[PDB]
Enzyme design. Structure first.
Site, PDB file in Angstrom:
ATOM      1  N   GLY A 177     -13.370   8.942   2.598  1.00 30.87           N
ATOM      2  CA  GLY A 177     -12.741   8.695   3.876  1.00 30.87           C
ATOM      3  C   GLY A 177     -13.543   7.850   4.839  1.00 30.87           C
TER       4      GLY A 177
ATOM      5  N   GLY B 141     -14.610   4.478   4.456  1.00 29.80           N
ATOM      6  CA  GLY B 141     -14.260   3.070   4.514  1.00 29.80           C
ATOM      7  C   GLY B 141     -15.111   2.224   3.592  1.00 29.80           C
ATOM      8  N   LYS B 142     -15.436   2.773   2.426  1.00 30.89           N
ATOM      9  CA  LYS B 142     -16.237   2.069   1.435  1.00 30.89           C
ATOM     10  C   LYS B 142     -15.447   0.998   0.698  1.00 30.89           C
ATOM     11  CE  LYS B 142     -18.786   5.191  -0.633  1.00 30.89           C
ATOM     12  NZ  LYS B 142     -19.187   6.076  -1.738  1.00 30.89           N
ATOM     13  N   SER B 143     -14.297   1.355   0.136  1.00 36.50           N
ATOM     14  CA  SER B 143     -13.462   0.424  -0.601  1.00 36.50           C
ATOM     15  C   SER B 143     -12.786  -0.599   0.295  1.00 36.50           C
ATOM     16  CB  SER B 143     -12.402   1.188  -1.388  1.00 36.50           C
ATOM     17  OG  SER B 143     -11.369   0.326  -1.826  1.00 36.50           O
ATOM     18  N   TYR B 144     -12.464  -0.241   1.534  1.00 30.20           N
ATOM     19  CA  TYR B 144     -11.927  -1.215   2.472  1.00 30.20           C
ATOM     20  C   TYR B 144     -12.960  -2.263   2.850  1.00 30.20           C
ATOM     21  CZ  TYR B 144      -9.204  -3.055   6.369  1.00 30.20           C
ATOM     22  OH  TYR B 144      -8.488  -3.867   7.214  1.00 30.20           O
TER      23      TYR B 144
ATOM     24  N   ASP C 201     -22.163   0.120  -5.664  1.00 28.62           N
ATOM     25  CA  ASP C 201     -21.295   1.011  -4.894  1.00 28.62           C
ATOM     26  C   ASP C 201     -21.743   2.437  -5.181  1.00 28.62           C
ATOM     27  OD1 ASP C 201     -18.391   1.618  -3.542  1.00 28.62           O
ATOM     28  OD2 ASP C 201     -18.766   2.926  -5.259  1.00 28.62           O
TER      29      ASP C 201
ATOM     30  N   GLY D  41     -21.355   9.762  -2.855  1.00 26.12           N
ATOM     31  CA  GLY D  41     -21.662  10.596  -1.671  1.00 26.12           C
ATOM     32  C   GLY D  41     -22.617  11.740  -1.954  1.00 26.12           C
TER      33      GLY D  41
END
Ligand SMILES: CC(=O)O[C@H]1C(=O)[C@@]2(C)[C@H]([C@H](OC(=O)c3ccccc3)[C@]3(O)C[C@H](OC(=O)[C@H](O)[C@@H](NC(=O)c4ccccc4)c4ccccc4)C(C)=C1C3(C)C)[C@]1(OC(C)=O)CO[C@@H]1C[C@@H]2O
Ligand SMILES: Nc1nc2c(ncn2[C@@H]2O[C@H](COP(=O)(O)OP(=O)(O)OP(=O)(O)O)[C@@H](O)[C@H]2O)c(=O)[nH]1
Ligand SMILES: Nc1nc2c(ncn2[C@@H]2O[C@H](COP(=O)(O)OP(=O)(O)O)[C@@H](O)[C@H]2O)c(=O)[nH]1
Ligand SMILES: Nc1ncnc2c1ncn2[C@@H]1O[C@H](COP(=O)(O)OP(=O)(O)O)[C@@H](O)[C@H]1O
Ligand SMILES: [Mg+2]
Lengths: 440, 431, 345
Positions: C95, C97-100, C248, C251
């Site tokens: 939630g 905002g890593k992929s965005y 990438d 967590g």
């Protein structure tokens, strides 16, 4: 009738537990088999006391204790020792392995698989109780079990029981002496959790009791069997008004109220002034004035931190034996005349008194003497703000290189937990500094 | 019930173990018929560590014997305490390693480690709770190195949450007993550094000097030298087999002695060691033992701890004592000798006491020290290695059995990348 | 001095969070990032060299997807053509905002689609008959300190993801034994390869969102440039290589609050040990790019080991830390910011 559940953790709490029950079984006339040959004198009454010992219809007395160690070395010595016939067999050895001096093993990884056995055993204990008032947790700041399992258990008892006193007796880590490289970490990790649940943590330091046993008892080679007895006398002085008659009786919620102003500053020190031997039992008259003056000497504290590097906030002098309150009034008058003992501007009273007519007991094999009166001083003090600073400085170096951290990560701890724990401690030294400032 | 599986591979391991099983027995009152003829009652309590019960109240040790030849296995049988070892555990083969690390790791050790793991899984799954594995082997003989390291790897793949404490004899500076000690030691370092938790470096020259200067022994056989290694191996596991005022174990000592996971090479040591005549001239106290154990002469690693800084020391005391005395003494050491300790690690010393000492002593002690001086031992091998590798001297026997020069380059790089990590905490600076 | 540059980005509230009137727990002084509890007793302040306020669309200093690329990744795209290696890391929780930020949406792309269009455009504007440019790539994962390739299909079985090996070539350095090294001409290939890999990646459902990355993913671009300073004999002699890794990370996941046993726990242990080592490395690197002599413990995780030649030396490292601005998830944010602060220190 009052009830108080005692919860011993780790080698230090369990070994301290061995001395407390050795003392209480003598204060009450109980033999290690649980029997009681004092009832033949009266044939009735309440010479047994439900604050510590439940009673069967057979004439046996069982303590309200739980010994959880997550290792079997110390609870097997009770199962084979002189007190095997006293304790109910559910002493939680559990313990495939110990916590290896690691919060991460005693909290979650190896702390689980045993705690539900403890809470179930504790649930059974408070259902036999009518007037439960308080918990007494004896553990150690610095170990893995005593650091993590205590934290977990307190987090669970605050959920289950809630509005119940929870008094800790902890071996504070000493500045110089230490038996482990991972004591600073575990201490600052235990405080993080316990500070939101516990209500008063009475600290002791072995480096202070060593010097006491040296200068006053004349023991040049002391061990833990001797200090654990002094601690037993402390808890006997706290747990006296619930068992014996007196003039000013002090319940356990009084410590929670007359010593903790704010719910974070609840780490008071402790003393027991007449620590004299039978040799110097003579050459001394052992009056209230001498004792009350001793309790405020920087030496005779059971913790090593100068009261003159800070100010007193609250004090609590539990007297026992032959004491007349005029003597205590004169004693407390003498301290307020003295300038070395400096008090916060926001507490002009600053003292509490509690008197009891049953004097302390002398164990065979003991170093202390017989006394017609004795005193325990429990004081809150800003002095500890240095001790906390010392521990924080020890934490600040090793964590600057992430030393010993993979041992914690390997058993279920995140890096941010260490940083979160440090932050809570920076915010406790600021509170002491904020308390020391004078009013305007 | 904490339980150790003892493995011992090679003539050094087989002849140290053969003395260790002679000492633990004496400590537990077990005889060569596996019976129990002791006097006290704490022995049988925690005997499950090393021994296993049998039918007629007989105790068989968890030995797993995998020397690659047959002579060492035969000597243990035709020997004092050999009729208690399980016959199905005397695993062996013929025509051993040839002082070659590769034969004991690829060619001739791969044909025999399955048969050994058959015993490991059979002596580990018969445990209520296992603590770790205890290897005794050699660096500089091929079999012990190779067939030890491959075994370490297989167990740390099968049993990764367990201790793998190793007792390894390292090659000595002045004189050697094989011309391929450097290669084999480096190749074993590359497989131990990555797959261990507490390695105990032993050296025979330090033991000779101990036997000479302290014990006043001028004809010491290897039985005399293994008599000291047994003592340390025993003292590590005293607070798992006897009660104490302050207990420890393998994992507690590991947690206290390994800041970063690769600095698990320790100088061992034991006290009170004394000559038979000079035992009526000194008192048995903790100051004497502290002065004996923190002396460079009582090291067993061939490294002077004054050429470096002690990162983390330990002390496993045995006997009836006063913990104030231990605390005061282990504070005096760290206050006086501050330069020999590290500044960013406030208490560099751990303590542990047991109430049950050895058969003839009123109190004993044991010592484990992590020190930067160990880099010397490595810095030497890398100097030997890179010479012999710069000319490809004895390599057509390592390549013939399926190896590449890359496995030598990797290991040499790892060794120097451990020297660096020990030397990053070896400079005399101030805060 | 800019051997390592750490940046943090504050993703705006989700539509559900906007409906819930979730309190804002992260604020700006332009550069500082202050985190105030919902109680407002203690306030925590963090400072980094680059901050991306993307909470509103009106704040002066709004960092969109084009202010991220132009500020962190394009200097690394231009440190490649000089022949020097680069790394980009992405830390954050579910939630955050890593992929965005890395990949992006179809309307709003991230770093990878922009990198792998600007590079191929600079190659369509610098390649001549003299100079020539060649790009290769790979895409692998770490799972419990075991390398696993993702651009290969399985062997049609219950469990088989082959563990490969790390080896130290004496001249070049660490590398993987079995790594697919496929060629690439434009983004239309990278997209298919990544879409095939990310579905073979490791992703479990613990007491959180039911898709949690339990693995680190490394994705490399080896750019080889050949030049012909003509002299009669052998030509195209010059050869400069530059590795552009785009990692990438996963967590932290503390295990007390997310009760786990068995495999999930073993994954958490690895994910945390690796990140501990990585932060130690990034600390110790800036500690030696600021006038000191230290040792970098590369050899404690397979990630720091294989990226040894792309992290240090003349390399340049960038790292994006993503955090949420809501009070529902606040320890994740504190840990994320604390990790990046340790990196900057
Ligand atoms: C009256 C007296 O003091 O005799 C001692 C003795 O002379 C000394 C020198 C013993 C003696 O040890 C040696 O002479 C020796 C020689 C070479 C190598 C190693 C030892 C002794 O043999 C050793 C033996 O020590 C033990 O009793 C322990 O149980 C020892 N025994 C064994 O290891 C052992 C080995 C095989 C079979 C049975 C026992 C031990 C030590 C550590 C851990 C477990 C056991 C004893 C009392 C002595 C003698 C007999 C002279 C010492 O032994 C140790 C390691 O403690 C050597 O220095 C100590 C101090 C002792 O004073
Ligand atoms: N006063 C006193 N202190 C003790 C005693 N035993 C241990 N300690 C102190 O406890 C500290 C170490 O904590 P331990 O109790 O050993 O740790 P633990 O709680 O046993 O947890 P473990 O890791 O499982 O052993 C040391 O600093 C000792 O001084 C004792 O009998 N009396
Ligand atoms: N301390 C000690 N060391 C030994 C003993 N026997 C051999 N060693 C050492 O161990 C090495 C022997 O290697 P080894 O494994 O026996 O060779 P292998 O038979 O081919 O496997 C030599 O370097 C010796 O220094 C012993 O009994 N005691
Ligand atoms: N800066 C941003 N602007 C707009 N939306 C964002 C931004 N950052 C994150 N989001 C939104 O967050 C949602 C989910 O987060 P996601 O990108 O999946 O992170 P993760 O993959 O770690 O869960 C996406 O649908 C995306 O629109
Ligand atoms: Mg213990």
């Amino acid at each position: 009738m009052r009830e108080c559940i005692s919860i011993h953790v780790g080698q230090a709490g369990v070994q301290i537990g061995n001395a407390c029950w050795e003392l209480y079984c003598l204060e009450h006339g109980i033999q290690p088999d649980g029997q009681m040959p004092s009832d033949k004198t009266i044939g009735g009454g309440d010479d047994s006391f439900n604050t510590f010992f439940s009673e069967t219809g057979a004439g046996k007395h069982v303590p309200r204790a739980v010994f959880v160690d997550l290792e079997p070395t110390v609870i097997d010595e009770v199962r084979t020792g002189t007190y095997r016939q006293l304790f109910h067999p559910e002493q939680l050895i559990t313990g495939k392995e110990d916590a290896a001096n690691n919060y991460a093993r005693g909290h979650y990884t190896i702390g689980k698989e045993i705690i539900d056995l403890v809470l179930d055993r504790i649930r059974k204990l408070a259902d036999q109780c009518t007037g439960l008032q308080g918990f007494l947790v004896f553990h150690s700041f610095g170990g893995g079990t005593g650091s993590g399992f205590t934290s977990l258990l307190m987090e669970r008892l605050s959920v289950d029981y809630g509005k119940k006193s929870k008094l800790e007796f902890s071996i504070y880590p000493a500045p110089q002496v230490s038996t482990a490289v991972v004591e600073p970490y575990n201490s600052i990790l235990t405080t993080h959790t316990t500070l939101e649940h516990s209500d008063c943590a009475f600290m002791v330091d072995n480096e202070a009791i060593y010097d006491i046993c040296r200068r006053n008892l004349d023991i040049e080679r002391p061990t833990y069997t001797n200090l654990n007895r002094l601690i037993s006398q402390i808890v006997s002085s706290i747990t006296a008004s619930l068992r014996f008659d007196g003039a000013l009786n002090v319940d356990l919620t009084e410590f929670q109220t007359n010593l903790v102003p704010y719910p974070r500053i609840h780490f008071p020190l402790a003393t027991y002034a007449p620590v004299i031997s039978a040799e110097k039992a003579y050459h001394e008259q052992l009056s209230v004035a001498e004792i009350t003056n001793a309790c405020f000497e920087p030496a005779n504290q059971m913790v090593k931190c100068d009261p003159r590097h800070g100010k007193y906030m609250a004090c609590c002098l539990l007297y026992r034996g032959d004491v007349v309150p005029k003597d205590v009034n004169a004693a407390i008058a003498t301290i307020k005349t003295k300038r070395s003992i400096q008090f916060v501007d926001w507490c002009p009273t600053g003292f509490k008194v509690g008197i009891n007519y049953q004097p302390p007991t002398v164990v065979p094999g003991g170093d202390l003497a017989k006394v017609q009166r004795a005193v325990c001083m429990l004081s809150n003090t800003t002095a500890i703000a240095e001790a906390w600073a010392r521990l924080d400085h020890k934490f600040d170096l090793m964590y600057a290189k992430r030393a010993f951290v993979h041992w914690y990560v390997g058993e279920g701890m995140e890096e941010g937990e260490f940083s979160e724990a440090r932050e809570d401690m920076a915010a406790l030294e600021k509170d002491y500094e904020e308390v020391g400032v004078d009013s305007v | 019930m904490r339980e150790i599986v003892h493995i011992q591979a090679g003539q050094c391991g087989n002849q140290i173990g053969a003395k260790f099983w002679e000492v633990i027995s004496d400590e537990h009152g077990i005889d060569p018929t596996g019976s129990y003829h002791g006097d006290s009652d704490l022995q049988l309590e925690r005997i499950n560590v090393y021994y296993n019960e049998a039918t007629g109240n007989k105790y068989v040790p968890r030995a797993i014997l995998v020397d690659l030849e047959p002579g060492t296995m035969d000597s243990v049988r035709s020997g004092p305490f050999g009729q208690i070892f399980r016959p199905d555990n005397f695993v062996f083969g013929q025509s051993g390693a040839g002082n070659n690390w590769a034969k004991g790791h690829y060619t001739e050790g791969a044909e025999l480690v399955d048969s050994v793991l058959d015993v490991v899984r059979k002596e580990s799954e018969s445990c209520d709770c296992l603590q770790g594995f205890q290897l005794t082997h050699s660096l500089g003989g091929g079999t012990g190195s190779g067939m030890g390291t491959l075994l370490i790897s297989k167990i740390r793949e099968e049993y990764p949450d367990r201790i793998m404490n190793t007792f390894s004899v390292m090659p000595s500076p002045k004189v050697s007993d094989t011309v391929v000690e450097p290669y084999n030691a480096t190749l074993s370092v590359h497989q131990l550094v990555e797959n261990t938790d507490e390695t105990y470096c032993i050296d025979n020259e330090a033991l000779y000097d101990i036997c000479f200067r302290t014990l006043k022994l001028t004809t010491p056989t290897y039985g005399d030298l293994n008599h000291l290694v047994s003592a340390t191996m025993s003292g590590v596991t005293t607070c798992l087999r006897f009660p104490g005022q302050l207990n420890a174990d393998l994992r507690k000592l590991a947690v206290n002695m390994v800041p970063f996971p690769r600095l698990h090479f320790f100088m061992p040591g034991f006290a009170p060691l004394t000559s038979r005549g000079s035992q009526q001239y000194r008192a048995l106290t903790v100051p004497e033992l502290t002065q004996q154990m923190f002396d460079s002469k009582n090291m067993m690693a061939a490294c002077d701890p004054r050429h470096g800084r002690y990162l983390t020391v330990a002390a496993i005391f045995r006997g009836r004592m006063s913990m104030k005395e231990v605390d005061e003494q282990m504070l005096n050491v760290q206050n006086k000798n501050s330069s020999y300790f590290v500044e960013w690690i406030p208490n560099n010393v751990k303590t542990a006491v047991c109430d049950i000492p050895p058969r003839g002593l009123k109190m004993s002690a044991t010592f484990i020290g992590n020190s930067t001086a160990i880099q010397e031992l490595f810095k030497r091998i890398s100097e030997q290695f890179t010479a012999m590798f710069r000319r490809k001297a004895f390599l057509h026997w390592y390549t013939g059995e399926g190896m590449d020069e890359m496995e030598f380059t990797e290991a040499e790089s790892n060794m120097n990348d451990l020297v660096s990590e020990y030397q990053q905490y070896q400079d005399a600076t101030a805060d | 001095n800019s051997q390592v540059t750490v940046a943090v980005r504050v993703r705006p509230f989700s539509k559900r969070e906007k409906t819930e009137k979730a309190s804002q727990v992260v604020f700006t002084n332009g550069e500082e990032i202050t985190v105030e509890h919902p109680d407002m007793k203690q306030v925590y302040s963090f400072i980094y060299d680059v901050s991306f306020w993307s909470f509103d669309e009106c704040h002066p200093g709004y960092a969109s997807q084009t202010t991220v690329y132009e500020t962190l990744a394009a200097p690394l795209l231009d440190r490649a053509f000089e022949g020097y290696n680069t790394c980009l890391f992405a830390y954050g929780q579910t939630g955050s905002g890593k992929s965005y930020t890395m990949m992006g949406l179809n309307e709003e792309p991230g770093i990878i689609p922009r990198f792998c269009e600007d590079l191929f455009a600079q190659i369509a504007k610098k390649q001549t008959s003299e100079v020539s440019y060649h790009l290769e790539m790979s895409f692998f994962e770490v799972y419990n300190e075991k390398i696993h390739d993702l651009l290969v299909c399985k062997g049609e079985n219950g469990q088989r993801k082959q563990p490969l090996r790390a080896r130290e070539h004496p001249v070049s350095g660490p590398y993987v034994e079995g790594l697919s090294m496929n060629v690439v001409s434009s983004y239309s290939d990278i997209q298919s390869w990544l879409e095939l890999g990310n579905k073979q990646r490791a992703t479990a459902a613990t007491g959180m969102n039911d898709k949690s990355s339990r693995s680190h993913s490394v994705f490399t671009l080896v750019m080889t440039q050949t030049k012909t300073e003509v002299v009669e004999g052998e030509e195209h002699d010059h050869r400069i290589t530059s590795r552009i890794n785009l990692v990438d990370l996963a967590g932290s996941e503390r295990c007390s609050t997310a009760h786990s046993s068995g495999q999930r726990l073993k994954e958490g242990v690895s994910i945390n040990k690796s990140l501990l080592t990585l932060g130690k490395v990034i600390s110790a690197l800036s500690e030696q790019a600021n006038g000191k002599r230290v040792f970098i413990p590369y050899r404690e995780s397979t990630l720091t080991w294989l990226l040894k030649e792309s992290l240090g030396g003349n390399s340049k490292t960038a790292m994006i830390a993503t955090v949420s601005p809501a009070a529902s998830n606040i320890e994740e944010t504190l840990s994320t910011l604390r990790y990046a602060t340790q990196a900057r220190l």
